[model samples]
Structure formats: structure tokens, C-alpha cells
Target: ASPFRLASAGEISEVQGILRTAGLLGPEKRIAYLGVLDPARGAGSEAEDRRFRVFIHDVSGARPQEVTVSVTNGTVISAVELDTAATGELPVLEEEFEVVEQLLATDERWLKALAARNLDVSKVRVAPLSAGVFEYAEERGRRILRGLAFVQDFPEDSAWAHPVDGLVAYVDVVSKEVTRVIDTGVFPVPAEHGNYTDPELTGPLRTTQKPISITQPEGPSFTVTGGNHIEWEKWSLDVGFDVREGVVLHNIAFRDGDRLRPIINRASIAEMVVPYGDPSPIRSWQNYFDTGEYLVGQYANSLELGCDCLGDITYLSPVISDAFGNPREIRNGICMHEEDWGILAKHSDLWSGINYTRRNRRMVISFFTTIGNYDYGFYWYLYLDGTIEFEAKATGVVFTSAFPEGGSDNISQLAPGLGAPFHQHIFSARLDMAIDGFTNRVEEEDVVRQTMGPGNERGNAFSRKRTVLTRESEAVREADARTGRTWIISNPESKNRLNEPVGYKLHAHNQPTLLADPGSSIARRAAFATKDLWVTRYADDERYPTGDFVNQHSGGAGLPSYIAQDRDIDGQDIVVWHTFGLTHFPRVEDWPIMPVDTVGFKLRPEGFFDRSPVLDVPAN
Candidate 1:
């Protein structure tokens, strides 16, 4: 198999057959995950060493059980049912969402709660949500989903606008029962129907906006060979798709004069947590692990040809197994194209008689996933200037709730009686860095001011303070805007012309981390979100920042567990986990549908190259 090649449809089916023959999987069981195992495990660097990781959920037992199996070639190597007492919850299934809705239809308690509020049961929409961590005995060891109610005047009406506030239903999926119902009090359902798709609801269209069409008659300056391997400009990488984390890039390398230099072994947005700030009982337990619990990639949007992508585009359709253990294809799940960036490099020679300029272009690979009320666009950019960037765009309807005519301090009113709460979307990106080579060390750099007593009479002298992070305990770091902090991953063996270690610098946005209290359930589950950066020795199993089972997991698994050993990381093959995102406080303009708000970080070549690589480009 090619490097980081995605599991083909044939491979997917073959793995399913192997599991069934081994009696480890059944037709009724659900496949939470199925993908090519990381190459670091099972000596997977060779073509014949390809392996698959499968997470199966069995609901045929007394209680729902979860198992992880490793399959290679035509054999099942290992299968282990996760320890239920440890609170490792399997990823939620697509069929399970429908099951919750069906289970709620005849539940008298849930129907009565709606009837007491004079809401028509037929017009109500139940949103199946992850049953977050709680101490309730009935939900302690069961597969569960929390149901929230919304009302829609018409099928096309946005249910988010009309929240049936102060009501919740706990549904045990395995038992097919609505275990509990909580109704605090009757609150007004917002009368304003925020269906932005309807012209009448949105008023007249804007005439000031003009159609901006981008055409590349020469077509995109990139090629997709063998399914997912992409090559453009000086960049080459293999794209891998996963049910849990979508659009993972592998063996990312940049072409030099005679050879390709490895940058990152693998990269992906491992996990994300959306923890709402509302302290009320109705929303205090509202934190969601979007990527882990819900499997964001599995719900990827089938992108429109010209609308979703502006120019000539190439797309990859990945195969994923459904709950029934059958292969399903996500058509056009990944979009790739070249975007016209404003500038690359330009210089009008004031001292010379000539000028030099070069047009900037970026290879953009992206995918969008809609998780219930919100849609997230994950994008990866490779620039001509040797820069790699990962961006997450948040849009779609804000999760709203019915409130008084006057909204509360923490709430932002989007309609007469509908308000949205403040929330944070913290995304953790795992960069399994192989900068130049696998053996690398991490160094933190900060600009420091010199004292007047030192070599500075005017107190204007300053220098960068560089500190090498030698161990896991010392590498857990935070972004500091005050000192202009950034981390550098470099291979000491690969020195540049100036004798500096070949390196790439990580530029992080100094945004807020998780705001939940240290002792809160969300705080424990998503402990990796509390810091901006974490560096550890490479381990194939240490892929997701929040660990494998994030559905209803207990704390201290992923990053925290990976670093517990505090192994020596200096000049060793290491991985960099960076958390960057935005804190959104909903506004009135965000109603109906929200505009895309983007947040990301950058990785640029520091001393990786001897000189400017783009100087050879011909004049545009």
C-alpha cells in the first residue's frame, strides 16, 4: 500500500468479513470506527504491513459493550472489550439518533411535558444529544442520549428559533426507554420564525454585493494521484479519511533541490469541545465532544461543485462503514483546489532600475461537517512560501433557548424571546512532526527586554530567550502574546547553510483555553483543552487528544495519560499537540444563520531552507 493510503472499499469489506469470520462482529453490531491504523504501529511502514483499527459496539448483550480490534492482511490480531467500569463510552451511531427519536414518541412523561406547555407534540423536534457525564445511577453504565425539544411552525422553519425551554429527556438507548424527564417551568417559545432561507423572512437581498467569479482556465495547479495523494507546487502529501477525525494528512513533505524533506509524519484535528457558558440546570451539562462523541467526519457535507469551491477543484470520495457493517461512500467528502492569495513576495527596487514580484497561490484542502445545530469547516493550506496552516470555520444556526423579553447578561438575544449563550470551541490539532527527520527537539522562544543596568542605557535593548523543552513535564506550554511566544521543532542533525538546525516554527493565536472550573466534569473530560500546547514522545496509540472513547468517558486519558510517563523528548521523535479556537458570544446578527468565523494556527519554515525557495519562480 502507498504511504498513508486510505482503506479502499474492498479493504473495508474485507475487514468486515474477517471480523465476522472471527466471530468478533455481528450484522446487528455497529462499527464506531474503521480506518487504516497508524504506520508507527505493527511495523506498518512496509506495504505488506498495512493494518486496520476497528471499534465495534455490540448492543445484543445485557448492556451495550464496546470492543477495539486490530486486523492485518487476512487475520484478526487482537480484540479487547473496553473496561466498562472505567467509563469508556463508544462513539454514537447514526441509527442510534433515530432510535432516540422513536423511543421518545410514545413516552408519556415526555409528551406530557410538552402538553403542559400547550405545545403541539406533532410539531416538536427532538434533538438527540450526547448524554454528558452525570452521577445519576440509571445512566451510570448505560448507553444514553439526552433529548432537547424544539418547535417548528413548518417543516422548513428553523427549529433553533423556537426552543422549548426548561425541558430535557434522558433516553437509555440500549433499553429503548426514556429513563427520565426534567421540566423546570414553562417559558415562552419565541414566535419569531428565523427561516433565513425564506425570502420573506430575510427581507430583500443585497444589491450592493457583486458576483465575484474565479476562473482558472488552465485548471488547478495540482494533481491527485491514487485516490488521496496530492502534489502541488513544492508540496506533496497523502490524505487519509477517518470516521472519527476527518481529512488526516500523512507524510507531508516539501521538495527541495534534489530530494523531498519530511515535515510532518501525520496531522489532523484530533478532538474538539464545545462547552456552553450557561450555568442554569437546563444547560450546565451542555458540553459536547463534537469530533469524538458525534463523529463529525461521518456527517460530512456533499459539497456543491461551483458553490462550495470557486475554482477548478478535485475531490476525494471516502468510504465509511455504516452501523449495519456495510460500506458507504461519502461523495465529494474532501475538496481540494488552489486559492489566489493576495501576495507572495514583492519588492520595488528603489536603489535599482528593476522590480521583482511573484503571485501567491495556496493549495487548499478542506471538508465541512455538520454536527446537529452547527456546521464546521476544516481547512488545511499549503502556501508557496513554505507555510502550513490549519483553519476551522464555525457557522450555521446558533443553539438558542427561549428566554424573557429581556435577555439575561450571559445571553445574546437573536429574536423577541430567543437567546443564545456564550460558548467556546476549542480544537486540538495533533502534529506528528517529522521535521527533516523523526529525531527532533522542541524549543520555546520569547522576546525579553534587557535591563537598563545591562548593555542598555536607553532601556530599549531586547533579545529572544530560547529554552529547550527537555521532557514532557517541561513541554506543556501556553501561548503568550505579551512575550510573543512560539515553539520551534527542529532536527539537530539536519543543519542549514548557516549551521542552524532545520526547523519549523509554530505560531499560535493567544486565545482563551477552556473556561470550565478545574473540578467540573467537562474540565476533567477535556483536560487537554486547558492548555495551548503539549509536547510528548511519539506513540502511535496517542492519536486523539481526548483519548479513544470520548462519548461518556471519565477524565485523564489522552494527553494527560500520554505525558504521565514524562519521557525524555529532547532530540527524540516527538508530536506537538496545539489547541487553538475562538470564544463566541452570540449576537443578534448571528440569528437565522451565522456567518463563518475562522480560527487557526500557522507552521512556517524557520531555518528549514538555506535561502528563499520562491526566488526561482518566473515573473508573473
Candidate 2:
């Protein structure tokens, strides 16, 4: 019997003859035969320590085919198909191209005007002047100018023509009057090369992937504690929670406290709080701390009496110290404590312990909103040793700070002694913080001994417990109650000092101005302001070739490397992730509020640290 145990002698003889002719499978044939015999097992070792999950939600009622793909070792781990039930679904295509076409049509006016002047508008083609510049026109002309008129007049006699508004026009060549159209039209959306999508994200069912080649910081480990959803007249909201190191890091109401409250409270917020009245009553309270202008005495009363009636409710808890000794906490309040404030204020460092020896913490407690008037908000921070820090973020239509330049009114008396005549200018403001702690320490006995009562009795007794140090002088002192906390108030001596003078003033004319005014070209104006800030429009193939609205106004002339590129949207490739952070101040009309959407921030960790410090922590 043959060792092969063939069914027949003839088969065994045939196998032997074939092997002999092939030189017994040659030198590299041992493993090759195994792989051929069992293809699944033959594949390389199974991928290790890899996992994936995907979720999608139908923003519209459309029941599109849902897909989920899981991968490990560059191979499919699991592919699932979701059975979507039909809801009254309309395709997202209709709205996708509507705004883009409207924007492009606005430029048609300039084209029509140029066509009337005997230019061949049909020969006009649009190209980016620079990356993110959306209004450069190419034409067969000698006079090359850079503006909207050039774009409108280019090939003045083309098949299609339209005039664009509010753009500087330029002629491309002398022979052909090319209109440059600086601000009109749209920009092409850029491409995304790396994996920037959230990995733990889950929803209905969708496809999202991360780049295997790129390394990402291990996201802080969090456990979803709880969540809820709320539906309003026009919109719906979703809330969720996560716990880190025993501290509850809330991802609630879409990460927006103001929006989340209605759901959390289960009450409908009134839409129009102060309609058609002197909005100053509301504006005063909102900008009180920052501008020091309290039109209504309510703000001053609140400040002097203490705004919070409820005592010491901890929003974040179970603080942990990172390897470097920086204290991390998840709290629900605004601003940081005194000692914490000192560390940030003096050193300009956000991380504690590793960069410096002191522990600091901050929080924002409340946010207020008003329509057409002003939005007021308060935030505070606390030190691990227990000191308070506070600040505000305010916005409004008419700002007291922007008083008329030439007017000679008692500007100081306007409200909080601003000392200027009023001028109407829309304003937006935010607080910047740097708290410094651990600057210097002093012995408790010295301060008490030097400025003690008639007798140094208290000073000598207090010195036994601890020592105090001047943050700036590095002088040491015996322990006292004051040694536990110290604050370096910024610009405290300025005529109008509320918090640290890191106060920033942004005017309607500043970069990234609000576009809500009815009389202004808000969208067009916003395009110009947002051009440099990495904003982009949704991609719709029916509207743009690249299916995106980035680079339409500026033209991809001078684009930097960080912006992401085109991707599939609703089965069409379009631009996504053009901007990193998108913040919008809600209007009163948008009330009963919607859910807070996720906002993203990008950090180049390597740029900020000497090495991969976070990685130094062993994986749990």
C-alpha cells in the first residue's frame, strides 16, 4: 500500500510520477504546499489588538442602504448590512447644490453686465486665484486685473454671463477684459489624507475608517455613563455621558451646556425673552464682568451679592494626577481657583505639575442668550487647594466699548465707567486665561510677624503649621490660611479691570465677523472672513466638479497642508472636514433649541512636547 493511501494503486503511482517530475516540490515548496492546501490558515498570523465599529444616522427620513465594515490586518473582519425601514425620505441632493447655485448665480450679474459690454462671456472659465480663493477668472485678454469685474467681463461674449457683487474686478490681458471677482462664486473642497474621524463613534450604520499608517494619541479612556434624547418643534437633540478616572466627563446635549439644559430640564426655553424693548437690560448683565458696563443695576447687585445661591455643587470630580503630576478633573463650572489661576496667568502653561509644580482647575458654570441684544455668560475655575477664578464670554449688536471716537461725552459714566459716547457696532467677545501658581513661596511667620496685631501672638502660633511664599519673589514664610491660595489679578489697576487684562475686543469689522445682519451680504462677507480659517461648503456634484464649495472664492492659489480633501457624501464625492472648529451663536428665533453638535479641535502634540509623553504611560 502506498503511504499516500490513494483510493486506487493507479492514483498513487500517478502522484509519485508528478512529484518526481517537479523535483519533489523544490527547495521553497514546503510552506507553499501548506498555504495551497489550506488558504484560510495559510494567510499570515491573525491580526492582533485591533478592533473597529461604525455607526450612521439618517438625518433625513430616507432609507438608504446602510453598511458597516470592520477590518484587522488589512483584511475584512466583519461586514454587516443594516435593514433600514422606509421613512418618508427625500434625497439630500436637492439642497446640496441649491446654495452653491445661488452663490454662483449671484456672480452671474457681473457676467451679464460684462456681456452687455461686448465681452465673450462664453469663453469665461473660473479657476482658483489662490487656495481657498474662489473667484479667479481665466480669459483670453492682455489686461490681467485681479477683481470681480475681470471675472464678469472675461471672454465678454461667452454663452453664459452673470455679474458678481462686492468683489474687486481685474483684467487678465489687455485684449480681453478679464474680471477677477474676488469674493463671489465658490471654492473647491480639499481632500483629507489622514484618519481624523472619531473611532468610538456609533450610530445607525455607516462607513468610516482611520489610516493604519498614521499614529493617533490614545483618546482618554472614558465610559459612557448615561444619555438621553429630546425632540423639539423643529429639531431633535441627543445627550451622552462618559466617565474618566471616576470623574464624569459629560458629552451631553451635544456638548453644549446651553442647548443641553432644555433637554436636561425637560422644559421648553422661551424663544423671545426680550423682544422690541431696550435690550440694554439684558446686554448689561451679559457684558457686565468683561466690559464693566452694567446698564441695569441687576448685574452689579448680582456680582456684589454673589451670583450662585446654591452652595458648592461639584460639576466634575474624582480628579487624577497624570504621570507628570498634573491634576486632571472633569468638573461642570466656569473659571479656575486662585492658585490654579496663578499658574496659568503667570507661566502661560495649561498643563500643571509637569510644566510646573502647582495644581490648577477651571470651569464655566452658565451661559445666557438674548436675541439681537446681547448674550451673557459666567465661568469660574478653582485650585486643588481651593481658590476661585472667574470670567465671561459675551456678544451683542451694540457694544459700549466701541464709543464714538470724537465724541466728548463722559465716557466713563456710560455704564461701568467706559467713558465714551455710544456708537453702534456689533460685537463678539471671549476670555483668554493664563493662571500662574507656584511662582514663589514665603514663610508664614514672616508675613504674620511683620503685620501682626498689636502683639505677634497669632503670627507665631500660625507659623508652626506651614510656610507661605511670594509667587514672584520666591520668598518663604511660615504657614497661614492665606498661604493656601494666591492670585495675580491681571491689569487690576487699569481704568476698567474686571479680570486679567487678557481681555480681547472683537468688532464687526474684525476677522470672522457675524453675518446675521439682514442689510448686509452675510454669506458673501462671511466667505471672505472664513477663507483663511478653513471653512468649506458641502460637496454636491450637481453644483461643483469636486463636489465641494471650498476654494471656490479664493481659488487654490496658496493652500497650506492641513486641510482635508474630497470624500463621498450621499453617494457623491464631496469635500468634508474643511474647518476644524465650527461655533455658532444661536439666535432667539432658533430657540426651543436644537441639540448640540460635536465640535472638533486639532492639536499637533509633537510640536508642543519634547517627545511622546502621553505614550510613556503603559497601556492599561
Candidate 3:
């Protein structure tokens, strides 16, 4: 099935025209919001094979009404009124006039102040200042929008690569009036950042010769069919983009012999929080909730071919709405294909078995989203061994700072002016698990030491303890290496040959929980980052862990509220949220451009497979 692109301009115009004919989309009625609604597996037809559902939020009547329209090939096929079922709408960025107003109000004086010192102020750039965990920092309980400003030189060639550091601004979103200025006074960072990979800059480390090359005479084995459906070997998944969470995989079911088993309903990153170490004015409020506030998905740059991904690749374009609500395709937005995984299995027997070896291959769908100075490459891999891996690599530049002489005695100076600060990027992913069906239960299994008692006086013995999490609140436990804590999503009705309930295990590796004070405002808004794993009863409206309204939202909703009920999740439809990330202690090499620092997890079949699912794999 070929992926259906979103409605074209004519298609949207047709929808508006139909609404006008139906007295729903005229000048008298205001179109508050309009977006695409993707049809589920069985919800569409063959006559109109490729149809895009248009959702409109109309605010003309006494109350806002949501209008749904089905469109195809520049025509409005059907229209109706319904609830805003899926929350894919991105909060519109501030208008151009308003953006300039906020910038001039907050930083005009600062720019002039820097201009006197031979700095460029002719061109100024101001962008979204995603609010931190919102607290009442103003008079009369007012809300404000945040922004960051930068100066770039003109004539193209002499322009600055990145923004001026240590400046942030806040303003009232409603009034567009600058309320405060957060100026740390740290400016004049090197205009020429040494991104070692950029050939445009003749740098010391720039690769003059080809460093990476792959040749395949036989082309590729995988096929990225239409409709974002990627099929390699026996694996298949429909890849899609989420405005906040970036890329996501849906209908992730694998073919096992004659059974097409549904393992996970949906999977995607929930949130990412990067907290700084220093207490400087700028660094003090440096904790960043990448998803809720700065929405990384919105800043995704197209992958740069061989540099971003390698070997027999297919690039998929994603349809998205731009700043002014115009629909466009994000070209090469997603990359998919299969690659060699070294070796899958190798063994030998003297008599019964000859030497057996098979090259393991993984079908990967990936995308890259830049968060300010850093670039994160997200890869979702399906291995032939029936294991699924989620990998997020943090590369690019490190957020640098001029340190107080003794920043770290162990590291060399980055430049004469800067020292990389210690920080951590914490990412949590939400997995709606359905082994055979919706009914699932979680059991906490831990490896612990056997205490000296009647059983063993030597105290040298170790044992594994099992704890069943019957409710939501009880499921909020941190990962403990001491006990080797692990949660298994078990299906009670299905049992493997071992007589254990067929299940999938969830584990997080190289994870560090959020270090913010539990009561701090940053932690308050991003409560989901505090725990390693969370299990809650499945609810359609509960898609986001940090609440649906994260833009400048107070810390009243999200995970804390979602788990307040402490409802029973055992033997029920369940969703799991696993948080994992890196505590980046920036090194000198991390300065101009940082090497990839990755952190994520994988889910392998626990008791779900009676035998090695890939045991029948052929020799290469």
C-alpha cells in the first residue's frame, strides 16, 4: 500500500468550498484550526483509494464545533462534525508581527548595547522560547511566552552559524508585550563553529578524502512500499511522524510462521529533558523539556544522504503543515532500509551439525531532529532474531560555556573561551503493548541476594524475587541494578512450552533519572522524567505523558495526574512508559561538534517465543 500524502492546496480549498456550500466555512465562521486525519486500516475505501480526512475547528457558533471532511485528488469527498479525536495539532507559532514585537520589546536595547561594541545587529532572529514547567513568575497570575534571539551577518558568506549565547526573553503571549529580559551578559561566541564534518569550512579536521563508502552490486533486498509500509524479510511497520514526539512506528506486528502476531500497538518517545549543571543566570534555567516546550519534530532537518544513514536506503517524505498553516512535504523526512548486523548466529557440531552461520540483518526506519546545538538520530530496528531495538544518538555541537577557571581539573580547555558543562539528556518512550490482545499484566522481577537465615547461614547465595504490580501507583518504581529489576508484559492466556505465560520483557540500559529537586518547577511540569518506567491503564486521550497542553502549561496535569487514580492495570489493556538517557559530561572533543552519544533500550521476547524464532534462519 502506497502512503497517501496529505491533501494538496486544491484539496484543502475544495474542503473549504464544500464547507462554504454547507454553510460551515464562510467568512462569517472562523476556522480556528484545520489539519489532516489519517484513516485507520479498515476505515477507507477502494474507489477513493487515497483519501485524506480534513479536521476543522470552527468557532462561529455559540460554541466551537469540529468539522471533519474526507478529501481526495483535489476534491472534498465527504464532510461531517466530530470531536477532536487525535491531538496532532501543533500550537501555531507567534505571528511575524508578534514575533518581532516580542524581540524588539525584550532585546532591542540589548542588541543596540552589543552593536556599540562592533557586533552585528542588522539581522536579528527570534524563535520560540518554550516555557519551562510553568510557575506564576508574574503579577496577577499572568502567563507569558518565551523566546531566544540571535544575530546573523548578511551577504550570506559572513553569516554566523549559531545564535549569540546567554540571552533569553519572555513576553505575554496575549498582549505580545515583553515582560522581562534574561540576559546573562555572555556573548560574542565564535561566529565560525568548527563542525568538523562541514567541507564548506576548510578546517583542520575536515575530511578531504572519502572516509566512508559502501558498494553493493546487487542493489538492496528490502522494499519501502507505498503508505510508509516497510517490509524486510518477515518484519513490517508503518512509520509516521508526531509533531511533538518526532517519529513513531505503528501496527508493529511481526509474521511468525502462519501467525501474524501483534506485539506492540504503538511506540514512540514520550519526552526529553536536558538539565544543565551550572547555576549561572542563563544556565540556571537551562533545564529543557525538548518535546513539550521546543517540540523537536518541528525542527527536523532532512537527513543528508550517506552522512546520516548508509547502505541501500530509501528516503520517505512526510507531509506537514508549515508556519502559516500551509501543507508541505518534509522531503527525506524518514529513511528506511536493511543493513548487515555482523552475524546472527554461529555454531558447530562434530557429527550431527555442520558449521552454521547466518548474517543478521536489521530493517531500520529512522529520522534526525536537531535540538538547538545538538542533533539526535533516532533509529527503530527490527532484527531477524525477533528482537526490536530503539537507538537515539546525540551528536553535533555541545552547549558550551565559559567556566570559572576550575571547571574540571581532569579535562583540557575546549577553546580559550569555553569549557563544556556537564548535562544529561533524558528521554522516555511510551509503548502500548498488546502481545496477543489487550489483556496484559506486569510482574516485577528482581535479582537479589539471599539473606543469611534458616535457608543459608553463609549469605553467599543470590535469588530472584518477583513482585506483581497490581495497580498504577505501585508500578512507579525506579530501575535498580542491585536487584536487577525488570518488568515483563505478560499475557495470562498464552503460555510457552516452559509453562510460563508468554510475555515480552522491558528494560532500560545506561539510564539516569532526572536529578532536579522533586519539588522544583522543572520537575513539576516534566514529572514523567522522574521515573524510569510507568504502567497505566490504556486511555485514548492519555497520549502525552507531560499533559496535552505542555506549552507554558502549569504542572497540574500529565503523568502525576494520570496516575493519581492508582487504578488497577493488571489483566487490562496497558501502556508502558520507559525513560532512558545520557548524563553527558562534556569533553574537549565535544566542543565544536560532538561525536554521537547514544542511549536507548530494546525489547526481546522473554517467554513469548517457545524456541529461538530465528533458529530456522538460513546460512549466508
C-alpha lDDT of all candidate models, in order: 0.85, 0.23, 0.67
As for candidate 3, its clashing pairs are: 1-226, 2-226, 2-227, 3-226, 3-227, 129-146
Model 3 Cα lDDT, one tens digit per residue, 324-406: 33555777888877788898887898898688888888878888887656788888989887788999889977765454455
CA-RMSD of model 3 = 5.3
- Per-residue lDDT tens digits for candidate 2, residues 219-286, read 21222122222222112222211111011111112111233211110111000011111122211211
Name every residue pair that clashes in candidate 1.
none
Candidates 1 and 3 compared by TM-score, better number: 1
The C-alpha TM-scores of every prediction are: 0.97, 0.18, 0.82
Q: Of the candidates shown, which would achieve the greatest lDDT relative to the real structure? A: 1
TM-score of 3: 0.82
lDDT of 1 by residue, 84-202 (tens): 54757788888888787677878898888888989888888989989777788666667889988899888877888899989988888877878888999899888888888788876
Candidate 2: C-alpha lDDT: 0.23
Q: Name the lDDT value of residue 499 in candidate 2.
A: 35
Cα shift from native, residue 207, model 1 (Å): 4.6
Q: Which stretches of candidate 3 lie over 4 Å from their true place?
A: 1-102, 105-108, 115-118, 123-128, 133-168, 182-219, 350-353, 405-413, 419-421, 451-461
Ranking by lDDT: 1, 3, 2
Candidate 2 TM-score versus the reference: 0.18
